[PDB]
């Protein structure tokens, strides 16, 4: 992985945008893909930590542009883009800064019922438009067919762990993957554009108006199961819980809440395997060891 100096961030922008004067530059945060710089308190520029990170950023840019102005909550607008090299699909992208603070579970529970209800409706209306976006232009690099993902993960687990597990333990991996595969409820969705990292850290809130003012981080958006954007909100400790998320489901007019719960339980167990794969794909060796240890003693 790579980090950046303030000097580098500014030379990279100066090369392609020589008339853009940078007065203030600060780290605003960090994901798995990119380090984020706040520029002139007006822009957030993402710089890729690695090539995989690049690819997501290139994806994020193309998605931001395709969905510009079609959705009922503010989203970053792409203003500045970098260049491809032998290492990055995109050296950086600068987007408009959306002001506000993450809508943490804590922050949401403290609001009056009226603003809570309103945040539940604003989220439903947001997803409902997001999931309605025409997919016809999105190529396979943005399509994430879940059956293929589960089959592809299975092969990665096996390539990665074949020398790391015993007999009975790989058998349990097999049994788990065979049961997932058997269950038709995971694969029979109408594919569509999903945020795919749809959690409280990516929901920005205006505490002066008590209203959600932005959705951010589109680096994982893909064409996949719209239930993914409800289940990423349901996680009980880190996220909103089922009361609040059921309000989103009902404002969204979701027809099959029980299926949503079922997908959530599956994804809860699946996390261990995700941790191994993400482990080696994004560099995180702590994730890898935790997931391994969990499969070892599940
Ligand atoms: N367009 C944006 N406006 C405000 N913050 C952003 C924007 N894009 C990314 N970020 C911030 O930097 C972090 C890591 O990517 C985000 O979770 C968020 O705080």
How would you describe this structure to a colleague?
The protein folds into two domains: 6-96, Phosphorylase Kinase, domain 1 (2-Layer Sandwich), CATH 3.30.200; 100-298, Aminoglycoside 3'-phosphotransferase, Chain: A, domain 2 (Alpha-Beta Complex). The longest helix is centred in the C-terminal third of the chain and has 26 residues, at 257-282. It has helices spanning 6-16, 51-67, 105-110, 113-130, 146-161, 167-182, 228-234, 242-251, 257-282, 285-296, and strands spanning 25-30, 34-39, 43-48, 78-81, 93-96, 101-102, 192-194, 203-206, 211-215, 222-224. The protein is globular, with a radius of gyration of 20 Å. Helix 9 (257-282) crosses helix 10 (285-296). It is of the alpha+beta class and 298 residues long. Residues 28-31, 34, 36, 44, 76, 95, 97-98, 201, 216-217 line the site of adenosine (ADN). Residues 28-31, 34, 36, 44, 76, 95, 97-98, 201, 216-217 line the site of adenosine.
Notable traits:
Aminoglycoside Kinase, 10 strands, 10 helices, about 300 residues, monomeric, 2 domains, transferase, globular, binds adenosine, alpha+beta, about 15% strand, Phosphorylase Kinase, domain 1, monomer, Aminoglycoside 3'-phosphotransferase, Chain: A, domain 2
Question: Layout of helices and strands, plus pairs?
Answer:
Elements: H1 6-16, E1 25-30, E2 34-39, E3 43-48, H2 51-67, E4 78-81, E5 93-96, E6 101-102, H3 105-110, H4 113-130, H5 146-161, H6 167-182, E7 192-194, E8 203-206, E9 211-215, E10 222-224, H7 228-234, H8 242-251, H9 257-282, H10 285-296
Antiparallel strand pairs: 1-2, 2-3, 3-5, 4-5, 6-8, 7-10, 8-9
Helix pairs in contact: 4-8, 5-6, 5-9, 7-9, 9-10
This protein binds adenosine (ADN).
Adenosine binds at residues 28-31, 34, 36, 44, 76, 95, 97-98, 201, 216-217.
């Amino acid at each position: 992985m790579r980090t950046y100096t303030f000097d580098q961030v500014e030379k990279a922008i100066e090369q392609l945008y020589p008339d853009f004067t940078i007065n203030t530059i600060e780290i605003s945060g960090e994901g798995n893909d990119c380090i984020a710089y706040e520029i002139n308190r007006d822009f957030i520029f993402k710089f890729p930590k690695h090539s995989r990170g690049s690819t997501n950023l290139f994806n994020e840019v193309n998605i931001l542009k395709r969905i510009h102005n079609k959705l009922p909550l503010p989203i970053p607008e792409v203003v500045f883009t970098g260049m491809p090299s032998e290492t990055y699909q995109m050296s950086f992208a600068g987007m408009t800064k959306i002001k506000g603070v993450p809508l943490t579970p804590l922050l949401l529970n403290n609001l009056p019922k009226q603003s809570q209800n309103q945040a539940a409706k604003d989220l439903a209306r947001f997803l409902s438009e997001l999931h309605s976006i025409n997919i016809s232009g999105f190529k396979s690099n943005l399509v994430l067919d879940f059956r293929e993902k589960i089959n592809e993960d299975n092969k990665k687990i096996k390539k990665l762990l074949s020398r790391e597990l015993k007999g009975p333990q790989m058998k349990k991996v097999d049994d788990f993957y065979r049961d997932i595969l058997e269950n038709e409820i995971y694969f029979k969705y109408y594919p569509c554009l999903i945020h795919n990292d749809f959690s409280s850290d990516h929901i920005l809130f205006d505490t002066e108006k008590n209203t959600i003012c932005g959705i951010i981080d589109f680096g994982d958006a893909a064409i996949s199961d719209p239930d993914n954007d409800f289940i990423s909100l349901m996680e009980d400790d880190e996220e909103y819980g089922m009361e609040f998320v059921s309000k989103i489901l009902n404002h969204y007019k979701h027809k099959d809440i029980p299926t949503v719960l079922e997908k959530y339980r599956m994804k809860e167990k699946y996390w261990s395997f995700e941790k191994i794969i993400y482990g080696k794909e994004y560099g995180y060796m702590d994730w890898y060891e935790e997931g391994l240890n969990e499969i070892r003693s599940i």
